[PDB]
Amino acid sequence: DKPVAHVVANPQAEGQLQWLNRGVELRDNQLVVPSEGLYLIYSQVLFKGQGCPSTHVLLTHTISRIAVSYQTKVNLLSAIKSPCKPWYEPIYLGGVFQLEKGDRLSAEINRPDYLDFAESGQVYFGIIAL
Amino acid sequence: TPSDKPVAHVVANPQAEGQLQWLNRRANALLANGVELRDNQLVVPSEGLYLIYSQVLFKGQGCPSTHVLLTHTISRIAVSYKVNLLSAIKSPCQREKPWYEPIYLGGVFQLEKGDRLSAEINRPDYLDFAESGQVYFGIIAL
Amino acid sequence: TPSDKPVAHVVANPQAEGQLQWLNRRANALLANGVELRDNQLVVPSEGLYLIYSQVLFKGQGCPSTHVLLTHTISRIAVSYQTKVNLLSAIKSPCQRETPEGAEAKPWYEPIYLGGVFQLEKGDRLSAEINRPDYLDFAESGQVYFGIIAL
Ligand SMILES: C[C@@H]1CN(c2ncc(-c3ccc4c(c3)N(Cc3cccnc3C#N)C(C)(C)C4=O)cn2)CCN1C(=O)CO
Protein backbone atom coordinates (compact mmCIF):
# COMPACT_ATOMS: atom_id res chain seq x y z
CA ASP A 1 0.00 0.00 0.00
CA LYS A 2 2.66 2.58 1.14
CA PRO A 3 5.29 3.75 -1.46
CA VAL A 4 8.76 2.29 -0.64
CA ALA A 5 12.27 2.12 -2.11
CA HIS A 6 15.58 0.63 -1.06
CA VAL A 7 18.17 1.20 -3.75
CA VAL A 8 21.83 0.03 -3.55
CA ALA A 9 25.15 1.17 -5.14
CA ASN A 10 26.24 -0.37 -8.47
CA PRO A 11 29.54 -2.23 -7.70
CA GLN A 12 30.34 -2.49 -11.45
CA ALA A 13 29.79 1.28 -12.07
CA GLU A 14 33.12 2.29 -10.35
CA GLY A 15 33.95 5.99 -9.69
CA GLN A 16 30.21 6.82 -9.44
CA LEU A 17 27.49 6.49 -6.84
CA GLN A 18 24.96 4.93 -9.17
CA TRP A 19 21.74 3.71 -7.49
CA LEU A 20 20.21 0.37 -8.63
CA ASN A 21 16.57 -0.53 -7.89
CA ARG A 22 15.23 -4.18 -7.57
CA GLY A 23 6.72 1.28 -5.21
CA VAL A 24 8.68 4.62 -5.54
CA GLU A 25 10.42 5.23 -8.93
CA LEU A 26 14.21 5.85 -9.58
CA ARG A 27 14.66 8.46 -12.36
CA ASP A 28 18.06 10.10 -13.24
CA ASN A 29 19.73 8.59 -10.08
CA GLN A 30 17.02 10.32 -7.97
CA LEU A 31 14.08 8.95 -6.00
CA VAL A 32 10.78 10.41 -7.14
CA VAL A 33 8.04 10.71 -4.49
CA PRO A 34 4.73 9.38 -5.91
CA SER A 35 2.40 11.07 -3.35
CA GLU A 36 2.19 13.69 -0.58
CA GLY A 37 2.99 12.31 2.90
CA LEU A 38 5.53 11.67 5.66
CA TYR A 39 8.55 9.67 4.57
CA LEU A 40 11.45 8.06 6.29
CA ILE A 41 14.53 8.97 4.28
CA TYR A 42 17.71 7.00 4.95
CA SER A 43 21.20 6.32 3.59
CA GLN A 44 24.62 4.93 4.44
CA VAL A 45 27.90 5.16 2.50
CA LEU A 46 31.14 3.39 3.40
CA PHE A 47 34.54 4.99 2.52
CA LYS A 48 37.98 3.26 2.47
CA GLY A 49 41.41 4.74 1.85
CA GLN A 50 44.91 3.16 1.82
CA GLY A 51 46.84 5.37 4.24
CA CYS A 52 46.43 9.10 4.82
CA PRO A 53 47.40 11.58 1.96
CA SER A 54 49.20 14.90 2.79
CA THR A 55 46.23 16.83 1.24
CA HIS A 56 43.57 17.10 4.00
CA VAL A 57 40.57 14.99 2.88
CA LEU A 58 36.87 15.83 3.60
CA LEU A 59 34.24 13.14 3.04
CA THR A 60 30.70 14.37 2.51
CA HIS A 61 27.39 12.57 2.28
CA THR A 62 24.18 14.48 1.57
CA ILE A 63 20.47 13.82 0.87
CA SER A 64 18.96 16.65 -1.15
CA ARG A 65 15.32 17.58 -1.96
CA ILE A 66 14.12 19.15 -5.23
CA ALA A 67 10.62 20.31 -4.27
CA VAL A 68 7.90 20.18 -6.98
CA SER A 69 6.76 23.71 -5.99
CA TYR A 70 10.12 25.61 -5.56
CA GLN A 71 12.52 23.61 -7.88
CA THR A 72 15.71 24.20 -5.80
CA LYS A 73 18.28 21.67 -4.43
CA VAL A 74 17.97 21.84 -0.61
CA ASN A 75 19.87 19.73 1.83
CA LEU A 76 17.72 17.55 4.11
CA LEU A 77 20.50 15.51 5.74
CA SER A 78 24.22 15.96 5.58
CA ALA A 79 27.43 14.91 7.26
CA ILE A 80 31.16 15.73 6.84
CA LYS A 81 34.02 13.44 7.97
CA SER A 82 37.82 13.98 8.05
CA PRO A 83 39.34 10.43 8.18
CA CYS A 84 42.89 11.87 8.46
CA LYS A 85 47.61 1.64 7.13
CA PRO A 86 44.07 1.54 5.50
CA TRP A 87 41.29 3.63 7.12
CA TYR A 88 37.51 2.90 7.09
CA GLU A 89 34.80 5.56 7.56
CA PRO A 90 31.05 4.98 7.33
CA ILE A 91 28.50 7.84 7.09
CA TYR A 92 24.74 7.24 7.87
CA LEU A 93 21.88 9.69 7.45
CA GLY A 94 18.15 9.41 8.23
CA GLY A 95 15.04 11.36 9.23
CA VAL A 96 11.27 11.88 8.75
CA PHE A 97 10.16 14.47 6.20
CA GLN A 98 6.89 15.78 4.67
CA LEU A 99 7.24 15.43 0.92
CA GLU A 100 4.86 16.43 -1.90
CA LYS A 101 4.11 14.38 -5.11
CA GLY A 102 6.86 14.85 -7.71
CA ASP A 103 9.73 15.80 -5.35
CA ARG A 104 13.09 14.43 -6.45
CA LEU A 105 15.52 13.22 -3.76
CA SER A 106 19.27 12.62 -4.29
CA ALA A 107 21.85 10.78 -2.08
CA GLU A 108 25.26 12.14 -3.01
CA ILE A 109 28.95 11.95 -2.07
CA ASN A 110 31.95 14.16 -2.91
CA ARG A 111 34.61 11.43 -3.22
CA PRO A 112 33.49 8.35 -5.28
CA ASP A 113 37.17 7.36 -5.59
CA TYR A 114 37.11 6.62 -1.81
CA LEU A 115 33.83 4.67 -1.92
CA ASP A 116 34.21 1.07 -0.75
CA PHE A 117 32.37 -1.30 -3.07
CA ALA A 118 33.96 -4.22 -1.10
CA GLU A 119 31.15 -4.24 1.43
CA SER A 120 28.58 -2.48 -0.90
CA GLY A 121 24.89 -3.57 -0.83
CA GLN A 122 25.61 -1.74 2.53
CA VAL A 123 25.89 1.53 0.55
CA TYR A 124 22.17 2.16 0.23
CA PHE A 125 19.52 4.88 0.01
CA GLY A 126 15.84 4.46 0.67
CA ILE A 127 12.45 6.00 1.43
CA ILE A 128 9.48 4.55 3.35
CA ALA A 129 6.06 6.25 3.32
CA LEU A 130 4.37 6.30 6.76
CA THR B 1 -5.46 9.89 3.94
CA PRO B 2 -2.57 11.55 5.84
CA SER B 3 -0.58 9.31 8.23
CA ASP B 4 -1.84 9.98 11.78
CA LYS B 5 1.60 8.79 13.12
CA PRO B 6 3.24 11.17 15.72
CA VAL B 7 6.44 12.43 14.01
CA ALA B 8 9.01 15.17 14.56
CA HIS B 9 12.14 16.38 12.85
CA VAL B 10 13.50 19.49 14.58
CA VAL B 11 16.77 21.23 13.55
CA ALA B 12 19.47 23.39 15.26
CA ASN B 13 19.24 27.18 15.46
CA PRO B 14 22.53 28.56 13.97
CA GLN B 15 22.13 31.62 16.24
CA ALA B 16 22.84 29.93 19.63
CA GLU B 17 25.99 30.83 21.67
CA GLY B 18 27.10 27.84 23.80
CA GLN B 19 23.79 25.94 23.23
CA LEU B 20 21.94 23.61 20.91
CA GLN B 21 18.51 25.13 20.37
CA TRP B 22 15.94 22.94 18.57
CA LEU B 23 13.91 24.68 15.86
CA ASN B 24 10.68 23.35 14.35
CA ARG B 25 9.57 26.56 12.58
CA ARG B 26 12.03 26.11 9.65
CA ALA B 27 11.93 24.74 6.14
CA ASN B 28 11.98 20.95 6.23
CA ALA B 29 11.64 20.80 10.02
CA LEU B 30 8.49 19.13 11.45
CA LEU B 31 6.17 18.69 14.38
CA ALA B 32 3.13 16.57 13.57
CA ASN B 33 0.23 14.47 14.93
CA GLY B 34 0.63 15.66 18.53
CA VAL B 35 4.41 15.99 18.99
CA GLU B 36 5.37 19.19 20.88
CA LEU B 37 8.63 21.08 21.28
CA ARG B 38 8.55 22.50 24.85
CA ASP B 39 11.62 23.78 26.82
CA ASN B 40 13.98 22.43 24.05
CA GLN B 41 12.42 18.95 24.47
CA LEU B 42 10.27 16.67 22.39
CA VAL B 43 7.00 15.71 24.11
CA VAL B 44 5.58 12.27 23.20
CA PRO B 45 1.79 12.55 22.60
CA SER B 46 0.99 8.79 23.05
CA GLU B 47 2.32 5.42 24.33
CA GLY B 48 4.09 3.32 21.68
CA LEU B 49 7.28 2.24 19.92
CA TYR B 50 9.27 5.11 18.44
CA LEU B 51 12.35 5.52 16.34
CA ILE B 52 14.52 8.11 18.06
CA TYR B 53 17.34 9.71 16.12
CA SER B 54 19.73 12.62 16.19
CA GLN B 55 22.75 13.85 14.39
CA VAL B 56 25.21 16.55 15.42
CA LEU B 57 28.18 17.78 13.39
CA PHE B 58 31.35 18.97 15.17
CA LYS B 59 34.07 21.05 13.50
CA GLY B 60 37.30 22.39 14.94
CA GLN B 61 40.11 24.42 13.41
CA GLY B 62 43.23 22.34 13.94
CA CYS B 63 43.90 20.32 17.07
CA PRO B 64 43.88 22.78 19.98
CA SER B 65 44.98 20.42 21.71
CA THR B 66 44.00 18.77 25.04
CA HIS B 67 41.27 16.17 25.87
CA VAL B 68 38.75 17.41 23.29
CA LEU B 69 35.86 15.16 24.32
CA LEU B 70 32.79 15.26 22.18
CA THR B 71 29.61 13.83 23.58
CA HIS B 72 26.11 13.53 22.11
CA THR B 73 23.27 12.12 24.21
CA ILE B 74 19.57 11.44 23.75
CA SER B 75 17.85 11.44 27.19
CA ARG B 76 14.35 10.43 28.31
CA ILE B 77 12.35 12.04 31.15
CA ALA B 78 9.20 10.11 32.18
CA VAL B 79 5.91 11.96 33.06
CA SER B 80 6.83 11.76 36.85
CA TYR B 81 10.57 12.76 36.66
CA LYS B 82 16.98 12.21 32.81
CA VAL B 83 17.82 8.61 31.73
CA ASN B 84 20.25 8.15 28.75
CA LEU B 85 18.79 6.26 25.77
CA LEU B 86 21.59 6.74 23.22
CA SER B 87 24.99 8.26 23.70
CA ALA B 88 28.33 8.53 21.94
CA ILE B 89 31.82 9.88 22.88
CA LYS B 90 34.50 10.93 20.40
CA SER B 91 38.09 12.38 20.82
CA PRO B 92 38.78 14.16 17.46
CA CYS B 93 42.39 14.94 18.53
CA GLN B 94 45.22 12.40 18.72
CA ARG B 95 47.86 15.13 17.82
CA GLU B 96 48.14 19.01 17.90
CA LYS B 97 43.81 21.64 9.03
CA PRO B 98 40.17 21.72 10.24
CA TRP B 99 38.76 18.41 11.61
CA TYR B 100 35.18 17.07 11.20
CA GLU B 101 33.37 14.67 13.50
CA PRO B 102 29.69 13.76 12.93
CA ILE B 103 27.79 11.90 15.63
CA TYR B 104 24.60 9.95 14.48
CA LEU B 105 22.51 8.22 17.22
CA GLY B 106 19.40 6.10 16.53
CA GLY B 107 17.26 3.31 18.00
CA VAL B 108 13.73 1.93 18.68
CA PHE B 109 12.20 2.63 22.10
CA GLN B 110 8.93 2.15 24.05
CA LEU B 111 7.74 5.58 25.22
CA GLU B 112 4.71 6.62 27.33
CA LYS B 113 2.46 9.72 26.80
CA GLY B 114 4.08 12.86 28.28
CA ASP B 115 7.74 11.72 28.14
CA ARG B 116 10.17 14.53 27.45
CA LEU B 117 13.13 13.86 25.07
CA SER B 118 16.28 15.92 24.91
CA ALA B 119 19.22 15.69 22.45
CA GLU B 120 22.23 17.26 24.18
CA ILE B 121 25.97 17.89 23.60
CA ASN B 122 28.89 18.84 25.86
CA ARG B 123 30.69 21.27 23.51
CA PRO B 124 28.33 23.71 21.66
CA ASP B 125 31.38 25.82 20.74
CA TYR B 126 32.44 22.96 18.41
CA LEU B 127 29.02 22.67 16.62
CA ASP B 128 28.71 23.36 12.86
CA PHE B 129 25.67 24.91 11.01
CA ALA B 130 27.55 26.33 7.96
CA GLU B 131 25.15 24.27 5.77
CA SER B 132 21.66 22.91 6.52
CA GLY B 133 20.95 19.20 7.31
CA GLN B 134 23.95 18.84 9.66
CA VAL B 135 22.24 19.03 13.12
CA TYR B 136 18.81 17.39 13.81
CA PHE B 137 16.64 15.45 16.28
CA GLY B 138 13.54 13.44 15.53
CA ILE B 139 11.06 10.75 16.52
CA ILE B 140 8.93 8.45 14.31
CA ALA B 141 6.10 6.42 15.83
CA LEU B 142 5.65 2.84 14.60
CA THR C 1 0.61 -2.94 19.57
CA PRO C 2 0.38 0.06 17.09
CA SER C 3 2.76 -1.88 14.76
CA ASP C 4 3.22 -5.56 13.84
CA LYS C 5 6.88 -4.97 12.92
CA PRO C 6 9.67 -7.01 14.50
CA VAL C 7 12.01 -4.63 16.41
CA ALA C 8 14.70 -4.91 19.11
CA HIS C 9 17.10 -2.65 20.92
CA VAL C 10 19.13 -4.54 23.53
CA VAL C 11 21.85 -2.95 25.75
CA ALA C 12 25.10 -4.05 27.46
CA ASN C 13 25.06 -5.22 31.09
CA PRO C 14 27.61 -3.02 32.96
CA GLN C 15 28.01 -5.65 35.79
CA ALA C 16 28.90 -8.66 33.55
CA GLU C 17 32.78 -8.53 33.81
CA GLY C 18 35.00 -9.51 30.89
CA GLN C 19 31.96 -10.01 28.57
CA LEU C 20 29.43 -8.26 26.30
CA GLN C 21 26.13 -9.44 27.72
CA TRP C 22 22.98 -8.15 25.97
CA LEU C 23 19.92 -7.17 28.01
CA ASN C 24 16.27 -6.53 27.14
CA ARG C 25 14.97 -6.75 30.76
CA ARG C 26 15.90 -3.14 31.55
CA ALA C 27 14.32 0.33 31.13
CA ASN C 28 14.88 1.83 27.64
CA ALA C 29 15.82 -1.64 26.10
CA LEU C 30 13.21 -3.67 24.19
CA LEU C 31 12.15 -6.73 22.27
CA ALA C 32 8.91 -6.60 20.27
CA ASN C 33 6.65 -8.31 17.69
CA GLY C 34 8.36 -11.72 17.84
CA VAL C 35 12.05 -10.79 18.36
CA GLU C 36 13.72 -13.01 20.97
CA LEU C 37 16.95 -12.67 22.94
CA ARG C 38 18.18 -16.27 23.36
CA ASP C 39 21.78 -17.21 24.40
CA ASN C 40 23.03 -13.59 23.90
CA GLN C 41 21.56 -13.62 20.35
CA LEU C 42 18.72 -11.92 18.54
CA VAL C 43 16.32 -14.34 16.88
CA VAL C 44 14.55 -13.12 13.72
CA PRO C 45 10.80 -14.00 13.84
CA SER C 46 10.12 -13.68 10.06
CA GLU C 47 11.69 -13.46 6.57
CA GLY C 48 12.35 -9.86 5.36
CA LEU C 49 14.71 -6.87 5.12
CA TYR C 50 16.12 -5.69 8.44
CA LEU C 51 18.25 -2.83 9.65
CA ILE C 52 20.92 -4.37 11.83
CA TYR C 53 22.91 -2.01 14.05
CA SER C 54 25.38 -2.13 16.90
CA GLN C 55 27.36 0.47 18.86
CA VAL C 56 30.26 -0.36 21.19
CA LEU C 57 32.55 2.10 22.99
CA PHE C 58 36.12 1.30 24.00
CA LYS C 59 38.18 3.31 26.55
CA GLY C 60 41.78 2.84 27.71
CA GLN C 61 43.92 5.06 29.90
CA GLY C 62 47.08 5.66 27.98
CA CYS C 63 48.82 3.82 25.10
CA PRO C 64 51.35 1.34 26.60
CA SER C 65 54.44 -0.34 24.99
CA THR C 66 51.87 -2.33 22.85
CA HIS C 67 49.81 -2.26 19.58
CA VAL C 68 46.20 -3.00 20.70
CA LEU C 69 43.58 -4.42 18.30
CA LEU C 70 39.86 -3.76 18.75
CA THR C 71 37.35 -5.80 16.77
CA HIS C 72 33.57 -5.63 16.57
CA THR C 73 31.49 -8.00 14.46
CA ILE C 74 27.81 -8.72 13.63
CA SER C 75 27.38 -12.43 12.71
CA ARG C 76 24.45 -14.36 11.21
CA ILE C 77 23.58 -18.04 11.93
CA ALA C 78 20.87 -19.51 9.70
CA VAL C 79 18.84 -22.72 10.53
CA SER C 80 19.31 -23.93 6.96
CA TYR C 81 22.67 -25.80 6.39
CA GLN C 82 23.74 -24.34 9.81
CA THR C 83 25.16 -21.43 7.68
CA LYS C 84 27.32 -19.12 9.75
CA VAL C 85 28.13 -15.87 7.89
CA ASN C 86 29.87 -12.56 8.81
CA LEU C 87 27.63 -9.54 8.12
CA LEU C 88 29.47 -6.43 9.34
CA SER C 89 32.90 -6.09 10.93
CA ALA C 90 35.38 -3.40 12.00
CA ILE C 91 39.02 -3.46 13.23
CA LYS C 92 40.48 -0.43 15.10
CA SER C 93 44.02 0.14 16.52
CA PRO C 94 43.62 2.95 19.11
CA CYS C 95 47.40 3.26 19.58
CA GLN C 96 49.65 4.61 16.73
CA ARG C 97 51.89 6.54 19.22
CA GLU C 98 53.28 4.81 22.42
CA THR C 99 53.26 7.11 25.50
CA PRO C 100 56.73 6.83 27.26
CA GLU C 101 56.91 6.85 31.13
CA GLY C 102 58.07 10.41 31.88
CA ALA C 103 55.05 11.76 29.99
CA GLU C 104 51.54 11.44 31.55
CA ALA C 105 48.98 8.91 30.28
CA LYS C 106 46.15 10.44 28.16
CA PRO C 107 42.93 8.29 28.01
CA TRP C 108 41.86 7.16 24.51
CA TYR C 109 38.32 6.60 23.21
CA GLU C 110 37.40 4.40 20.23
CA PRO C 111 33.70 4.04 19.31
CA ILE C 112 32.70 1.38 16.76
CA TYR C 113 29.28 1.46 15.04
CA LEU C 114 28.21 -1.23 12.59
CA GLY C 115 25.02 -1.08 10.57
CA GLY C 116 23.39 -2.18 7.35
CA VAL C 117 20.23 -3.52 5.66
CA PHE C 118 20.07 -7.33 5.23
CA GLN C 119 17.69 -10.04 4.03
CA LEU C 120 17.07 -12.42 6.94
CA GLU C 121 15.01 -15.66 7.14
CA LYS C 122 12.83 -16.80 10.11
CA GLY C 123 14.93 -18.42 12.89
CA ASP C 124 18.27 -16.70 12.08
CA ARG C 125 20.39 -15.95 15.13
CA LEU C 126 22.34 -12.64 15.11
CA SER C 127 25.31 -11.87 17.37
CA ALA C 128 27.14 -8.56 18.11
CA GLU C 129 30.63 -9.46 19.39
CA ILE C 130 33.93 -7.87 20.50
CA ASN C 131 37.45 -9.24 21.15
CA ARG C 132 38.40 -7.00 24.15
CA PRO C 133 35.58 -6.74 26.78
CA ASP C 134 38.15 -5.39 29.29
CA TYR C 135 38.32 -2.21 27.18
CA LEU C 136 34.50 -1.66 27.10
CA ASP C 137 33.20 1.72 28.49
CA PHE C 138 30.30 1.91 30.93
CA ALA C 139 30.96 5.49 32.34
CA GLU C 140 27.59 6.41 30.78
CA SER C 141 24.66 4.34 29.51
CA GLY C 142 23.26 4.31 25.98
CA GLN C 143 26.78 3.82 24.47
CA VAL C 144 26.77 0.03 24.01
CA TYR C 145 23.69 -1.34 22.14
CA PHE C 146 22.51 -4.01 19.58
CA GLY C 147 19.26 -3.81 17.57
CA ILE C 148 17.23 -4.77 14.53
CA ILE C 149 14.36 -2.99 12.72
CA ALA C 150 12.24 -4.79 10.11
CA LEU C 151 11.39 -2.78 6.98
C1 LIG D 1 9.49 3.60 10.67
C2 LIG D 1 9.13 2.13 10.71
C3 LIG D 1 10.35 1.23 10.77
N1 LIG D 1 11.00 1.14 9.46
C4 LIG D 1 12.29 1.50 9.21
N2 LIG D 1 12.75 1.27 7.97
C5 LIG D 1 14.05 1.55 7.77
C6 LIG D 1 14.89 2.06 8.75
C7 LIG D 1 16.29 2.44 8.48
C8 LIG D 1 17.11 1.69 7.63
C9 LIG D 1 18.47 1.95 7.50
C10 LIG D 1 19.04 3.00 8.22
C11 LIG D 1 18.22 3.75 9.09
C12 LIG D 1 16.86 3.50 9.20
N3 LIG D 1 18.98 4.61 9.88
C13 LIG D 1 18.34 5.74 10.55
C14 LIG D 1 17.71 5.41 11.88
C15 LIG D 1 18.22 4.43 12.74
C16 LIG D 1 17.57 4.14 13.92
C17 LIG D 1 16.42 4.83 14.24
N4 LIG D 1 15.90 5.81 13.46
C18 LIG D 1 16.54 6.05 12.30
C19 LIG D 1 15.95 7.00 11.38
N5 LIG D 1 15.52 7.73 10.62
C20 LIG D 1 20.41 4.59 9.51
C21 LIG D 1 20.78 5.81 8.67
C22 LIG D 1 21.30 4.45 10.75
C23 LIG D 1 20.42 3.28 8.59
O1 LIG D 1 21.43 2.68 8.28
C24 LIG D 1 14.28 2.26 9.98
N6 LIG D 1 12.99 2.00 10.23
C25 LIG D 1 10.11 0.67 8.39
C26 LIG D 1 8.93 1.61 8.27
N7 LIG D 1 8.27 1.75 9.58
C27 LIG D 1 6.94 1.56 9.81
O2 LIG D 1 6.44 1.74 10.91
C28 LIG D 1 6.05 1.16 8.64
O3 LIG D 1 4.82 1.86 8.78
Swiss-Prot record, chain C:
Q: Which residues lie on this side of the membrane: Extracellular?
A: 1-151
Lineage: superkingdom? Eukaryota
The entry's stated outcome for L30F is: Biologically inactive
Q: List the disulfide bonds.
A: C63-C95
Q: What happens after mutating R26W?
A: Biologically inactive
Position of the signal peptide: none
Where does the record place the THD domain?
6-151
| Effect caused by changing S80F | Biologically inactive
List where in the cell it is found: Secreted
**Protein name per UniProt:** Tumor necrosis factor, soluble form
> Per the UniProt entry, what species is this protein from, by scientific name?
Homo sapiens
